[PDB]
Amino acid sequence: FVKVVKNKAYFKRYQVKFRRRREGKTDYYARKRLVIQDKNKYNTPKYRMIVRVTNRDIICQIAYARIEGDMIVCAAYAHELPKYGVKVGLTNYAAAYCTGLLLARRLLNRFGMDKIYEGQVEVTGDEYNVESIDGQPGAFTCYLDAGLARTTTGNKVFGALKGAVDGGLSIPHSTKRFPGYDSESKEFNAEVHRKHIMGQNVADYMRYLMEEDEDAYKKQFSQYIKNNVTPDMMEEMYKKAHAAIRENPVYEKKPKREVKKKRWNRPKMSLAQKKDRVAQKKASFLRAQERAA
Amino acid sequence: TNTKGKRRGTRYMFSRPFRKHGVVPLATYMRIYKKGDIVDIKGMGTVQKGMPHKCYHGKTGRVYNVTQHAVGIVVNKQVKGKILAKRINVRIEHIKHSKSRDSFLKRVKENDQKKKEAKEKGTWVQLKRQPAPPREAHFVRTNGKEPELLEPIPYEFMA
RNA sequence: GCUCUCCCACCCGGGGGGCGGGGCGGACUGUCCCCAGUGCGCCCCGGGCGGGUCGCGCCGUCGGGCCCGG
RNA sequence: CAGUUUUAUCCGGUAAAGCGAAUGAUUAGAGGUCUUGGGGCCGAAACGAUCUCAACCUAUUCUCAAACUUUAAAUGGGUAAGAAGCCCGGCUCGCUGGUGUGGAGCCGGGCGUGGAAUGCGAGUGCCUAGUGGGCCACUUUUGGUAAGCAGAACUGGCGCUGCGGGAUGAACCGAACGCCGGGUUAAGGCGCCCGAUGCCGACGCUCAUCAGACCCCAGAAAAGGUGUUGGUUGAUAUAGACAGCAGGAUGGUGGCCAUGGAAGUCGGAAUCCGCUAAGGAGUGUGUAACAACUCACCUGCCGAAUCAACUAGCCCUGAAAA
RNA sequence: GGGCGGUACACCUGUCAAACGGUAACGCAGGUGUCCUAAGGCGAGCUCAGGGAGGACAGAAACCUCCCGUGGAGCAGAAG
RNA sequence: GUUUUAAGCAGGAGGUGUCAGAAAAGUUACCACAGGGAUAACUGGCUUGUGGCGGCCAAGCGUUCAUAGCGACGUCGCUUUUUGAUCCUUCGAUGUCGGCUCUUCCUAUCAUUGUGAAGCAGAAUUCACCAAGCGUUGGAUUGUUCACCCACUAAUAGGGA
RNA sequence: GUCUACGGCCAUACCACCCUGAACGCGCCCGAUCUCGUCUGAUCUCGGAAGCUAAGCAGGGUCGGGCCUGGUUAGUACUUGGAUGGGAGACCGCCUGGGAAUACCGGGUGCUGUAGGCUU
RNA sequence: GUCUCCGUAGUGUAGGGUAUCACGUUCGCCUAACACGCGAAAGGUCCUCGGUUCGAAACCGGGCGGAAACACCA
Ligand SMILES: CN(CC[C@H](N)CC(=O)N[C@H]1C=C[C@H](n2ccc(N)nc2=O)O[C@@H]1C(=O)O)C(=N)N
Ligand SMILES: [Mg+2]
Ligand SMILES: [Mg+2]
Ligand SMILES: [Mg+2]
Ligand SMILES: [Mg+2]
């Protein structure tokens, strides 16, 4: 026989936390550093670069911050890839670098800095910190904002980082957590990173799964083989991402057929019905009471 | 002979209001503060860096300086008879705007609206604020019944 | 415009009721339901309350307009 | 410009209040399973059963707080109330930057119904005497049993200053001063000292063998009284009631078991209804007991009362100095 | 009154303080003349006291596991 | 003019706890001067806790019976003959303990005068009222105020100026 | 009507028990070659897609607690100024003006100022 | 004038998980009986109530009792 600890005097002295911490999507101690602008700047916005990982999808957005809630300028989803010809393994490191490139030259095709500030065309793996150009309008910068994903050594977020940088954005970084870093002697290779970019570690399953057993090649490759993709088609697309289909970056949001405006959620039971229910229950309990006994 | 510490007699003053503890909300910071604006000062116990001395909690002044994380400010104080004009350097948490100037900046505009209009009309529209005058003679209609006679209650010991 | 009580009807003049009554859609809960209670949307009719404003005629000033005007 | 007010605005944790809200203190019962024990208790054992005292849980209840608080006044503390403002062009920048972005500073032009109320001439700049032993009251307040004691906050006074009144008086109440005529008043006062009621003054309470008589102030109580004047609640009024010049109270029994002898007149669970305007095994005297008597409760003759309780007003006791 | 006895002789924390600030007495309850290469400076990761239900020797209290768990723990010392 | 040394300018350290910072143990009854009622020892003042005195209430004691006489736990007052508290007046001086002698005064009355109640039969004794005109002693020991003891007596009551 | 990043004091948004959930979505779920880590491939990291409505999810429900606002308590408590107003004193009345808080009884249970994809 | 110890079988008395000595005193051991010497008894509100505790008499006060102390300088 113990004391109930959720009393009235537990609910009176109980200040709730913030809504995004109750729904645990965020961090305010990691935001307060990233989002404020120094007061001698006077309404000069501070661009951050959101990267979100979902279990079937990748999201890459750009946004500064205001008092009315932080405001998007340019979004880049990862299921707009099968326009271009990558249909399977939609969320690997390769599409994490392809999306950050689609974001990069989307923004450059919304500001008017396409031909200037190209970035990298080839795919090598080394540092390409993009320097600004004298006389011309200056470079573009945006600070990263990963969030709640431990940035250890080999994350898919950084592939989107290397994509937007090689696209032309000027993001500060250092090659210490990229696939190819030796944690005992501190050097860095490029080809291990380019073996990890194009899809060769994904490919090697065309042996360890194609030889040793054949039953598991159909237990977990059931959409490559349905879309008729062999393990040698690890191929370039980036000239298609570069050329001209950011004149529809937004895909031209599709028109909206007129909806019936029908409802799928039962509305709130009113007052003058909740005052009527307990008269039914009191008369039913008294007419099923006095009759019986 | 009391002491002369930094935070004498501030048990209830730097304390947080009831059920408002915790994290400083993020629309306190990203508001903009120019030079010339009028600012009241309220202390706070969370961020200990850059507190004001306890004798400014409530005063109101204007800005002369803006820094990386702080603004300078000019206030007035009364020391043993005279009045000193002194200046401090306060971090952002301990600071709000004052809305005292705003109903004047709403009445400068309303007056210049009431002046640009109807001047070309040759009209003479009243501009000065005039205090609440003595109220007008007015009729009271008692349709039908009579006023209700009151009665002072006889005493009884309530307790 | 909003819509309580004199009173109105379901029910025993009153309480309960009221904004009532009529037609249609959908939703609702205890009871076997009938029930009836509610209740939103759409439409019609009845009923009083509440002043604004537009207006009317009549009564009401040892009234007001150089104490209007002939 | 202001020892002030109004209209807008923020700040504060005091008096009050509150424990069915936290932090601490605390009284009494109520339902439960034992959550555990010390003993009854049947028991070769029990939370089996136990009286439970008891703590334990839940809803309730009695009181509290300078170093405890959810709420939260009154007075009170800063700011703002237009030309030192607004609004249009434009320039420079080596800091800030996606973008002449972002700011700041500059040359120019345009706009006066003076933008709440009331009152008043203001601004700065030199040299410098005296002082640094302080006191009282209204409220607010800490130590102390208390002090014409000690110690702080707000305003005002004596000190520095007299004048009419308080019989007299450094501070209280009126009022602040050049020398003088006339008038009127303030706090106070008008039987005489002593200017003024030598009013046909108005309405009532009060008798002391210690009456009593005007802010600070010079003295006094708890409790008492059929001394009196008002008041309050119910219970007896042509319901002869409320005192008494009044007609009388026991045939069963002479109670039961009782006192040696007691019949009511002595002891005991008891205490009734039966012609009963009247039961009491007597309120009582008497007698060795009764006999003989009266009475609680009841029956005769006349023209308006009782019980407590406010100390409710004055008066008295309470109340002893050189 | 001096003396013997104390430190109100430099500092800080609550209270007296009369709701800004300031404010006294040999007025209260208390403490200091230091300690630390980490108990300083960054970053990742975790969440405490107490309470329940269980589990070999295990008991009032060793360790493990599950649930509730707005600070009831801790932050070198006095207290906020 | 050259080399050694010293003096120079700048920054830390060597400490003053009476902590805005002197280098410092006692006594005078053989004592001296400058001053103070801003500051003690007497009296007097305002106060009355302690001391002394008197009330109300009524559980019990009292062979029985609360209140003839007494009164528990509780509570309201006066007195300045005890000690304390304070520091207002006097330190260019108010002559400071006791006793002898000598007048007067108060009453909270020990005895005497006149009267009430008793657990008052008489004799004795306790209790209270009006009441201070009249009395209230002789001696041993101690510096004594205070105490203690022997006798007588009507009684050997208490104090102020 | 949903996903991403938010705003304000962050409760009208919390907690407890129930229930229905169309399509796109979010998620539990399938696994351990790839220098990601652990005593442990559960957590963290990666490569995935056969299969399905409990899910801080989403919406409604409780004569719910809790919270948010309104009446009562109350012109009560308190209080700035003043009086030769009582009273032995304690403290209480008056004029002048300001003026609260619980218990108790009622109503509400997320707006979304928000930008990008989406019941379309 | 009040602060410092400490109270415990009949006597006096040793000391966070039991109430302990020495003597007082009943029965039993060696002996030739005697003394000395020895072993088992009774004996406890560890001053009277409330809290710390899983368990306190030894921890905490409030309190009643006794004893031993102190009051200096006209
Ligand atoms: C010091 N003496 C005393 C004689 C002095 N010279 C003079 C004298 O009378 N002195 C004494 C006088 C007063 C002083 N005293 C006494 C009590 C008191 N409460 N306060 C004082 O000041 O005490 C002194 C004391 O004797 O010691 C001797 N050498 N005897
Ligand atoms: Mg208080
Ligand atoms: Mg004095
Ligand atoms: Mg004084
Ligand atoms: Mg004067």
Ligand SMILES: [Mg+2]
């Ligand atoms: Mg003067």
Ligand SMILES: [Mg+2]
């Ligand atoms: Mg006089």
Ligand SMILES: [Mg+2]
């Ligand atoms: Mg006055």
Ligand SMILES: [Mg+2]
């Ligand atoms: Mg006179």
Ligand SMILES: [Mg+2]
């Ligand atoms: Mg104040």
Ligand SMILES: [Mg+2]
């Ligand atoms: Mg530490």
Ligand SMILES: [Mg+2]
């Ligand atoms: Mg000598």
Ligand SMILES: [Mg+2]
């Ligand atoms: Mg000599």
Ligand SMILES: [Mg+2]
């Ligand atoms: Mg003196």
Ligand SMILES: [Mg+2]
């Ligand atoms: Mg004297």
Ligand SMILES: [Mg+2]
């Ligand atoms: Mg006394």
Ligand SMILES: [Mg+2]
């Ligand atoms: Mg008797």
Ligand SMILES: [Mg+2]
């Ligand atoms: Mg003299």
Ligand SMILES: [Mg+2]
């Ligand atoms: Mg002389």
Ligand SMILES: [Mg+2]
């Ligand atoms: Mg007498």
Ligand SMILES: [Mg+2]
């Ligand atoms: Mg929605």
